[PDB]
Amino acid sequence: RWAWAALLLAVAAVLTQVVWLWLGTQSFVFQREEIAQLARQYAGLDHELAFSRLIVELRRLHPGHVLPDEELQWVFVNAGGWMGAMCLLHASLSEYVLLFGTALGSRGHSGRYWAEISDTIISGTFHQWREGTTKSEVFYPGETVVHGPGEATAVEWGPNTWMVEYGRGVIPSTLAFALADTVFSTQDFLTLFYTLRSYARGLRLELTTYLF
Amino acid sequence: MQWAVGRRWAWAALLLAVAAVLTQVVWLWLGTQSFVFQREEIAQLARQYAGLDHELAFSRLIVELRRLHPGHVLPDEELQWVFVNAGGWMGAMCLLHASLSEYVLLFGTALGSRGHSGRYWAEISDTIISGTFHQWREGTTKSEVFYPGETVVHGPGEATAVEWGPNTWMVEYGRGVIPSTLAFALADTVFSTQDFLTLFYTLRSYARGLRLELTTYLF
Amino acid sequence: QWAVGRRWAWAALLLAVAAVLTQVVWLWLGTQSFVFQREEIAQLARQYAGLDHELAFSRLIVELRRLHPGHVLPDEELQWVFVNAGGWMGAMCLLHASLSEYVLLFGTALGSRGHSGRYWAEISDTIISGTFHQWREGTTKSEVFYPGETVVHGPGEATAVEWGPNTWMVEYGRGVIPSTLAFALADTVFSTQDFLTLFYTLRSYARGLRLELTTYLFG
Ligand SMILES: CCCN1CCC=C(c2cc(-c3ccc(C)cc3)no2)C1
Ligand SMILES: CCCN1CCC=C(c2cc(-c3ccc(C)cc3)no2)C1
Numbered sequence: 001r002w003a004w005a006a007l008l009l010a011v012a013a014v015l016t017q018v019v020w021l022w023l024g025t026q027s028f029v030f031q032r033e034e035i036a037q038l039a040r041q042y043a044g045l046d047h048e049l050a051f052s053r054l055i056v057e058l059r060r061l062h063p064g065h066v067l068p069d070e071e072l073q074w075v076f077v078n079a080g081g082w083m084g085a086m087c088l089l090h091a092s093l094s095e096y097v098l099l100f101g102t103a104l105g106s107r108g109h110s111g112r113y114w115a116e117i118s119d120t121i122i123s124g125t126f127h128q129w130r131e132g133t134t135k136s137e138v139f140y141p142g143e144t145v146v147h148g149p150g151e152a153t154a155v156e157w158g159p160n161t162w163m164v165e166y167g168r169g170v171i172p173s174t175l176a177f178a179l180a181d182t183v184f185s186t187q188d189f190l191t192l193f194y195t196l197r198s199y200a201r202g203l204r205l206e207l208t209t210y211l212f
Numbered sequence: 213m214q215w216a217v218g219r220r221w222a223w224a225a226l227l228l229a230v231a232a233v234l235t236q237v238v239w240l241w242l243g244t245q246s247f248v249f250q251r252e253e254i255a256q257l258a259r260q261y262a263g264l265d266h267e268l269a270f271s272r273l274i275v276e277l278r279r280l281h282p283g284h285v286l287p288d289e290e291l292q293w294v295f296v297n298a299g300g301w302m303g304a305m306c307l308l309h310a311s312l313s314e315y316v317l318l319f320g321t322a323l324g325s326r327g328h329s330g331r332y333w334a335e336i337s338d339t340i341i342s343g344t345f346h347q348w349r350e351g352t353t354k355s356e357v358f359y360p361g362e363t364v365v366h367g368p369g370e371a372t373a374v375e376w377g378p379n380t381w382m383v384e385y386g387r388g389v390i391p392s393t394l395a396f397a398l399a400d401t402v403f404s405t406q407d408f409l410t411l412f413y414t415l416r417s418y419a420r421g422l423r424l425e426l427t428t429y430l431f
Numbered sequence: 432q433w434a435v436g437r438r439w440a441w442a443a444l445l446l447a448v449a450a451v452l453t454q455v456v457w458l459w460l461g462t463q464s465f466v467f468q469r470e471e472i473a474q475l476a477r478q479y480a481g482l483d484h485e486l487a488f489s490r491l492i493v494e495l496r497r498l499h500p501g502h503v504l505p506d507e508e509l510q511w512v513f514v515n516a517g518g519w520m521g522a523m524c525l526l527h528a529s530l531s532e533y534v535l536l537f538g539t540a541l542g543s544r545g546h547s548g549r550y551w552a553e554i555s556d557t558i559i560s561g562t563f564h565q566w567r568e569g570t571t572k573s574e575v576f577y578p579g580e581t582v583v584h585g586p587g588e589a590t591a592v593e594w595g596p597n598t599w600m601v602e603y604g605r606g607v608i609p610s611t612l613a614f615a616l617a618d619t620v621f622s623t624q625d626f627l628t629l630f631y632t633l634r635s636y637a638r639g640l641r642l643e644l645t646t647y648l649f650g
């Protein structure tokens with residue numbers, strides 16, 4: 001039975017080799033500039049219409065990578081002390097695209113992620129206070145703010161602020177932060193479920209499209 | 213002996229009778245569900261004092277609430293402002309009535325606050341005496357603002373983002389599984405503020421409210 | 432010579448350790464010494480209030496080092512680290528820290544609101560710039576503090592606090608300092624999950640303790 005341990009790690013070595021090759025020869029659906037430019041084009045429109053225009057345009061540029069209307073949903077997000085709402089459009093293990101914002105405004109912890117996040121503002125104001133500094137910056141509609149991996153900032157959204165968010169990195173690691181307050185502060189298990197389901201729907205889509 | 217009845221059978225028949233009767237009169241306890249306050253009574257009552265400053269408005273409301281419902285309102289000896297930290301927001305409450313199905317309290321903030329309203333197994337109504345109440349309902353990308361005199365109604369299972377301006381005060385009425393709602397109102401107190409003295413104060417106010425509702429029921 | 436009971440000597444020793452510990456603690460309280468006087472930091476920080484906070488901080492650190500050599504952290508150990516607690520967020524720079532005292536620079540560029548924390552310590556905050564709103568427990572009014580003013584937070588007290596944008600202050604603390612850190616890291620553990628920040632904070636404390644340990648032992 002000692003040889004069975006060798007066979008166990010034999011196929012384990014090959015499978016891990018298959019995965020490694022796949023993770024490295026994998027390409028991305030979206031470009032950072034692509035998402036930013038679309039949002040910048042629509043920022044002058046009311047956010048409701050801007051959202052609709054952007055979703056339609058994303059679907060024609062990348063069919064089979066954007067969730068259907070039947071699976072689009074606004075779900076509150078409580079994390080880092082702030083509160084907003086998001087609508088997931090695309091979600092894989094390496095990328096996501098979502099609409100985010102708040103009608104009341106909010107402040108808190110940007111989060112510390114294993115990913116690069118790009119927020120292009122559609123309406124309102126985004127205040128950013130970078131770690132190590134004692135001054136803040138403000139971004140306005142049409143402008144894109146990037147959150148590098150391992151960076152942590154204090155953020156503030158003004159009343160009625162909305163943005164398109166494009167994330168790239170280890171996406172399942174971001175859920176730990178995004179659902180923290182939901183678990184320990186709001187106890188909103190229903191919201192917790194809606195979030196996980198939306199991610200599942202996004203993963204479901206990307207899997208079928210890749211398989212056709 | 214065609215009219216006679218065996219004693220053993222009759223004894224077991226009556227046991228089935230009391231069992232059938234009890235299991236049915238137990239059900240009517242939910243049918244004879246009596247709430248101490250009417251659903252829109254608290255709102256209609258506080259809408260009258262909204263013109264005053266919150267300090268006098270509270271005192272005159274508490275007095276009026278006692279006269280209308282004697283033995284259902286906590287005495288001045290057990291009235292206390294305690295902080296409330298939940299859903300990312302912070303305020304202070306003053307419990308006036310508390311049972312297992314109902315509660316009435318004075319709530320507000322002198323600074324203002326924002327956060328998650330909470331999903332309760334209950335129906336909550338808030339009537340504004342002073343300040344502003346902002347509500348952002350789930351699924352929408354817009355908010356509504358409520359002014360003094362108006363009443364915000366929060367149905368069961370609903371979740372909204374809330375914002376109170378500076379110096380907003382309100383009376384609050386809740387109907388439903390009150391102990392479960394208490395789990396939310398103490399969440400941030402445990403995992404964010406670690407204010408265990410406040411935790412004690414809140415639970416004590418509930419115990420005082422419950423003690424009153426049983427000593428009134430017993431006398 | 433005689434024997435003592437298994438419950439007799441047990442109680443006697445329980446009184447013996449009671450006699451020792453109580454007079455040992457009282458001995459400990461008597462030898463207690465503080466590097467900074469109760470109102471020393473406040474008096475010193477107010478002198479630099481009104482200036483650009485960068486300039487005020489730099490001059491203060493130089494002044495503290497000159498007044499208390501061996502009790503202020505070197506430049507290579509000074510570090511701005513985010514603080515998340517009680518619902519609010521800001522940044523701190525630890526200047527001095529032991530088991531009984533601490534001095535730190537604190538503030539926020541964005542502003543913030545939340546629970547002040549209920550500490551086993553006496554904490555004073557002298558404002559260099561910006562605004563400090565305080566809402567005391569049991570009250571329905573709030574007081575605003577402007578630069579040059581000092582806010583004192585007594586042990587066991589709990590307030591709601593609000594900082595305006597670009598508010599900066601100097602904070603001195605006196606009491607059970609390790610218990611205070613527990614609060615300061617509450618949101619970091621259960622809300623932000625920022626382990627890096629958590630590590631930075633604990634490292635800042637360790638550096639303060641090390642410096643205090645060396646100065647105590649070797650001058
Ligand atoms: C500095 C930018 C930080 N952003 C700010 C805006 C909102 C965030 C945010 C991210 C998410 C999210 C939801 C689902 C999945 C699968 C992944 C991520 N939900 O909300 C984080
Ligand atoms: C949508 C309205 C949500 N409101 C917002 C304001 C404050 C609430 C709130 C509820 C309570 C409370 C305290 C003790 C007991 C036994 C029950 C309830 N204390 O505070 C909940």
Ligand SMILES: CCCN1CCC=C(c2cc(-c3ccc(C)cc3)no2)C1
Nearest residue numbers: 514523528533547554584611612615636
């Ligand atoms: C009543 C004023 C409350 N203040 C408000 C501002 C920030 C505080 C605050 C305290 C600390 C801290 C960091 C390290 C150690 C060893 C001890 C304490 N880090 O931040 C507490």
